């Protein structure tokens, strides 16, 4: 899920991975003694299980987080251009792990104002960021334009399975809400599918200032509601 924002001038990436390790399962179960001795012997050559993941993010990424379902995980290291991840348990053959990562880029390098009209924007979104050796069985890319945006044209380099336009209410979406343009891609490769999704929409200043004016409308009708409940005589 990505989140374009014209008031903050920022784009905000959030990703939910449900990864399995389809390698060979391990006989005699799992034993922490053989794993820990296998770490202490030498050098961690190339073997099956997953200890660290290297997330290749866009260029300037600011606020990194890595959470599970039950809480957050503190074993993550966000160095420049690279977001390293250690899960809680090492993912052996056949094991599942569902997690969530997220970061925050500025919008000045993913969004571009068109030439014919000032209030028409064109966004090009990276279709896929992840570890270097992954295969994606299902991808649904939800881009979220702001509340008054109207999508004109949609182009994708990879042939998608599905596309739809809905709305979804986030924080202070008093009216209909964000424009959720969601793509459904089926079969993708991390190394191969180098593409960017191109959305051409408009976002006029008539609908750009309707956010503080809508919150002003709720505060104003709340205070006139206070005025009606204080000019009113109830004294038996």
């Amino acid at each position: 899920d990505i989140w374009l924002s014209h008031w903050a001038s920022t784009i905000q990436f959030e990703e939910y991975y449900e990864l399995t390790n389809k390698a060979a399962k391990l006989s005699k179960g799992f034993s922490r003694l053989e794993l820990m001795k296998q770490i202490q012997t030498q050098n961690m050559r190339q073997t099956h299980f997953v200890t660290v993941l290297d997330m290749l993010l866009p260029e300037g990424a600011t606020d990194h987080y890595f959470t599970d379902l039950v809480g957050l995980v503190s074993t993550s290291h966000a160095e420049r251009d690279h977001f390293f991840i250690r899960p809680r348990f090492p993912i052996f053959g056949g094991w599942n792990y569902n997690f969530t990562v997220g970061w925050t880029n500025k919008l000045s390098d993913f969004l571009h104002v068109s030439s014919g009209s000032d209030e028409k924007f064109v966004a090009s979104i990276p279709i896929l960021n992840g570890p270097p050796d992954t295969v994606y069985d299902n991808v649904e890319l939800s881009v979220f334009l702001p509340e008054g945006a109207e999508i004109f044209d949609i182009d994708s380099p990879v042939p998608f399975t599905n596309v739809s336009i809905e709305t979804q209410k986030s924080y202070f979406d008093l009216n209909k809400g964000h424009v959720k343009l969601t793509f459904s891609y089926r079969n993708l490769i991390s190394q191969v599918a180098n593409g960017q999704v191109l959305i051409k929409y408009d976002y006029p200043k008539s609908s750009f200032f309707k956010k503080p004016l809508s919150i002003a409308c709720y505060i104003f009708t709340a205070l006139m509601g206070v005025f009606v409940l204080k000019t009113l005589n109830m004294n038996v």
Partner: protein, 85 residues
């Protein structure tokens, strides 16, 4: 056409923002002082004593002003704490 939108993308200006994020919490604090002074002086126009039509008049103009400063203030103070819009 993906090529027409690609050419139309890479021949374009970048997004020039309206107000940057680093100057915006100062607008949140100054806006909080403004709408808190205007709305704090609005409940005393109905508070003390008056007639009815002048109390309605000054309450509704001062509540319009303090209400719109309140809404723009909580947009900027929304963007300040980490959540956006």
């Amino acid at each position: 056409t993906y090529e027409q939108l690609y050419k139309e993308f890479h021949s374009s200006k970048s997004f020039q923002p309206f107000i940057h994020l680093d100057t915006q919490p100062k607008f949140a604090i100054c806006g909080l002082i403004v709408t808190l002074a205007v709305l704090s002086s609005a409940l005393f126009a109905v508070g003390s004593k008056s007639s009815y039509i002048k109390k309605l008049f000054f309450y509704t103009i001062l509540s319009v002003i303090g209400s719109l400063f309140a809404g723009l203030t909580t947009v900027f103070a929304s963007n300040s704490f980490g959540v956006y819009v």
